[PDB]
């Protein structure tokens, strides 16, 4: 776990699943976001990587599934069982449940873990929001930064080498390797420009970025450029990312039920026809609108 500025982001393990649960179980709301392969829900290869929950908008549990390691570097953590993201998902479903974009949540959870739509349904910021201010972006960072005061952010990355002289002529060459601590300096790189919201294209910049500079000396080698595959990037940095969005997602809602309980009028055009239309929306989508 890691505590910054605040937030308390936890990565699950094995190991510290029971803990996790034990914290789930102890709340009664949870904001569920999902990280996944890409846009496009129904696309073959597509995949849940893993799973962002918020216990509270200082308290959140990074479940990875199917993260991996890129370019012959070791740097991600064991990913957990579909059936330990199954209990996650059991005990989460058992409380009030928020998302940002329940539609893309909800489709993921079903297409990749099999969730029926019947225990998924939950508030989503996004459409409350939208009754607050119909002329906002519907962005969560976008959402956070007007709500919550993050600040604007859109990264300077540390070398990763360490430059060796190794006896050769007679003379000494310069080999670069690889840092024992690359993974600390490069959570200090995301860490001096982290808002409590960083952006998904500044996190893969980073990620890229990282890469590249190993690449540009030759401590590896990978074909061609560095996909944006949210599977390959370094968890001890993504999870910061993912929970960030949980954590700002609940953050969100304790505004939006203020919001609501002012606008009763509008409290009941969000419960009686816009999640519901949503809902409709998303299981129509789930069979081939
Ligand atoms: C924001 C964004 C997300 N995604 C995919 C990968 C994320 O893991 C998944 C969930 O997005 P999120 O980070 O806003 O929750 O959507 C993209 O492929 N491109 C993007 O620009
Ligand atoms: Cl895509
Ligand atoms: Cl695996
Ligand atoms: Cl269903
Ligand atoms: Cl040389
Ligand atoms: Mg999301
Ligand atoms: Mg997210
Ligand atoms: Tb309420």
């Known amino acids: 776990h890691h505590h910054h500025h605040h937030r308390q982001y936890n990565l699950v393990t094995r190991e510290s699943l029971p803990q996790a649960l034990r914290r789930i179980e102890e ?10 392969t890409g846009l496009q829900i129904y696309l073959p290869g597509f995949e849940l990587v893993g799973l962002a929950v918020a216990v509270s908008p200082e308290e959140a549990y990074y479940f990875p599934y199917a993260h991996r390691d890129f370019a012959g570097l070791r740097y991600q953590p064991e990913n957990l069982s579909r059936e330990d993201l199954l209990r996650v998902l059991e005990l989460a479903f058992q409380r009030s449940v928020v998302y940002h974009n329940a539609a893309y ?43 919550l005061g993050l600040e604007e952010s859109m990264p300077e990355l540390p070398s990763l080498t360490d430059v060796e002289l190794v006896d050769t002529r007679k003379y000494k060459k310069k080999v670069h390797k690889l840092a024992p601590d690359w993974l600390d300096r490069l ?27 190993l690449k540009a000396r030759g401590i590896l080698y990978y074909p061609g450029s560095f996909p944006v595959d949210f599977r390959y990037f370094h968890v001890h940095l993504a999870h910061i990312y993912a929970l960030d969005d949980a954590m700002n997602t609940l953050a969100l809602w304790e505004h939006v039920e203020i919001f609501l309980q002012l606008h009763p009028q ?12 949503n809902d409709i929306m998303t299981r129509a989508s789930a069979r081939g609108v």
């Open 27 to 36: 709340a009664k709301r949870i904001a569920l976001d999902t990280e996944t």
């Open 187 to 213: 959570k200090t790189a995301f860490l001096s420009v982290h808002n409590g919201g960083v952006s998904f294209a500044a996190l893969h910049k980073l990620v890229a970025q990282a890469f590249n500079t």
């Open 266 to 277: 509008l409290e009941r055009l969000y419960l009686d026809i816009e999640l519901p239309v």
């Open 105 to 147: 949540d909800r489709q993921v959870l079903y297409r990749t873990l099999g969730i029926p739509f019947e225990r998924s349904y939950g508030n989503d910021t996004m459409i409350a929001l939208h009754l607050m201010d119909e002329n906002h972006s519907n962005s969560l960072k976008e959402w956070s930064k007007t709500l």
